[PDB]
Amino acid sequence: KVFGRCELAAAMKRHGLDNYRGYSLGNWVCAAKFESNFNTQATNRNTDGSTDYGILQINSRWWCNDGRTPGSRNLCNIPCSALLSSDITASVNCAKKIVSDGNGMNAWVAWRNRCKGTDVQAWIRGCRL
Incomplete structure (x- = not known):
């Protein structure tokens, strides 16, 4: 499924990701935009042979089992x-664990490079949440 921006915002908020570990909702939406373009079916192979999955591109090196x-x-x-x-739900629950691992949202390189230090609230502006 490809989410709309406000649609994803609402789903993230309902699952309690908003302000989780201090990261406002727009941070999460912006991460998702640049990791997956809001597409739950996104997959990408890493150099090391692991693969990243889903709207938040969670890596099989550490976080999930892909058999390969x-x-x-x-x-x-x-x-x-x-x-x-x-x-x-599963992506959100797993993201909560990842963001609690010590490096916060720096775990997501695309968040660090495209979202951190920007006007991330822009990603939820206009939404009725």
Whole structure:
């Protein structure tokens, strides 16, 4: 599923991602925009043979099981395919763990490079939330 911007905002907020670990909703929406273009089915292979999945491009190196990342972990205890669903619950729950790992949203390189230090509230402006 490809979310609309405000649609994704509302879903993230309902799942309690807004202000989670101090990161306002626009941070999460902006991360999703640049990681996936709001597309839950997004997948991308990394150099190391791991793959990133879903609206927040969660990496199989550490966080989910895809059956083909030898030596990886599965810290969210989920198949990576759960992260591609139209329902973002699994992605949100796993993102909460990732953002709590110590480096905050710097875990998402696209957040650091495209969202951090910008007017991230722009990503939720206009939305009725």
